Write a protein that binds this ligand. Sequence first.
Ligand SMILES: CC[C@H]1OC(=O)[C@H](C)[C@@H](O[C@H]2C[C@@](C)(OC)[C@@H](O)[C@H](C)O2)[C@H](C)[C@@H](O[C@@H]2O[C@H](C)C[C@H](N(C)C)[C@H]2O)[C@](C)(O)C[C@@H](C)C(=O)[C@H](C)[C@@H](O)[C@]1(C)O
Ligand SMILES: O=c1ccn([C@@H]2O[C@H](COP(=O)(O)OP(=O)(O)O)[C@@H](O)[C@H]2O)c(=O)[nH]1
Length: 393
Amino acid sequence: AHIAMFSIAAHGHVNPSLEVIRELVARGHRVTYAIPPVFADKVAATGARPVLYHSTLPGPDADPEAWGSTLLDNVEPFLNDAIQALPQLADAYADDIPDLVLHDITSYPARVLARRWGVPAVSLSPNLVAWKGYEEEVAEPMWREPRQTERGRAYYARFEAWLKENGITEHPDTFASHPPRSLVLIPKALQPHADRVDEDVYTFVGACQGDRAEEGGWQRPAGAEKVVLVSLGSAFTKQPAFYRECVRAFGNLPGWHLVLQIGRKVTPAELGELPDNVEVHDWVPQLAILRQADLFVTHAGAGGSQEGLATATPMIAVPQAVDQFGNADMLQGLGVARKLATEEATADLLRETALALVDDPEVARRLRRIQAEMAQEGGTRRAADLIEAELPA
Ligand SMILES: CC[C@H]1OC(=O)[C@H](C)[C@@H](O[C@H]2C[C@@](C)(OC)[C@@H](O)[C@H](C)O2)[C@H](C)[C@@H](O[C@@H]2O[C@H](C)C[C@H](N(C)C)[C@H]2O)[C@](C)(O)C[C@@H](C)C(=O)[C@H](C)[C@@H](O)[C@]1(C)O
Ligand SMILES: O=c1ccn([C@@H]2O[C@H](COP(=O)(O)OP(=O)(O)O)[C@@H](O)[C@H]2O)c(=O)[nH]1
């Protein structure tokens, strides 16, 4: 019926679920989407009707450091934003109560309002979720020393008091970290402690968009036996001492063709006369390239990691920052990748690693079983089935 999606103005919390919104609309449901004004047009592209609230969180364009760099500086803003957001949204939906509530993990008001409405809420997570064990295993030692501070005790007391005034007796950690129903938009292959996640609460549906492969008419060179892509997303990609290191590993290496990227307009020219079997770019139809590639040197960001698995492309994971270590360790543990520190990645080690991965029927054997498992996660139309299933009679 009336499906109301909720999120914040951050690409990583809106882009993952765009196509599922689109699908429920394409079905014939009336879908509205609570969002700050900056992303009004972004969500509107999907048929969804925007519903504009004001946010106090950093803007989508704002720097990553704007979100804080301590545990309490990371979490406090989501509560403070919720407190001022909630009464805007409660107002907005009074003259049109939605039938089902959809929401990104960051929206506390969606949780509160869904309970207020007596309607199902479905949480959409663009990253890993809690497993059975998480509170004792991970949430507790994380919170022991900060919750203990006057600052931490006060944060939790405030969170509790806000919930209680809303008729919610939930402890804030269960309210925040433990949804009653969740769809997870990463492959389960990239979820730590995968068997121990609660399937009756969480269903993994993986990426939702275009595999494969979005989208630009790339062509492997006639002659190429082994194509390698180096393509570190569109963010962590301004490294002097690395691409030139990749050129040296694969440049003039018989049989291999290197698709290399950087990101200017301009400029290929910090240096390197360059071998003939190397092509450089500012940007690529990455999914499209991986669709024929035999090897992927990746920073192991969420997208790249998903895309490598989606295309059964063995990976050299060379982690660089906050998005990466665990992802690289998991790709590692799947037996489909090698983790390298930036950084010892010598030309000889990169080459040796490359060779060691592309000629392994077993590495390929693991990647094929992963794609089969991802195909069961379905994608978009699948996420809509489950959301249609929760969308009461
Ligand atoms: C498991 C279940 C928990 O998920 C997490 O632990 C994941 C694994 C964090 O990412 C991890 C991993 C990482 C890299 O974020 C991807 C890290 O930066 C943060 C601090 O923790 C998330 C998503 C963080 O979001 C990120 O916070 C950053 C400050 C800004 C970033 N974005 C808006 C720019 C945003 O996505 C952050 C703060 O926990 C979200 C707030 C709302 C929470 O406290 C919620 C309730 C979480 O505890 C949780 C959903 O229950
Ligand atoms: O030159 C590029 C770089 C990035 N991407 C796409 O941009 C996304 C990058 O996301 P990821 O999580 O991998 O890295 P991030 O940039 O967020 O750190 C992925 O879907 C890539 O396929 C692309 O198509 N061409």
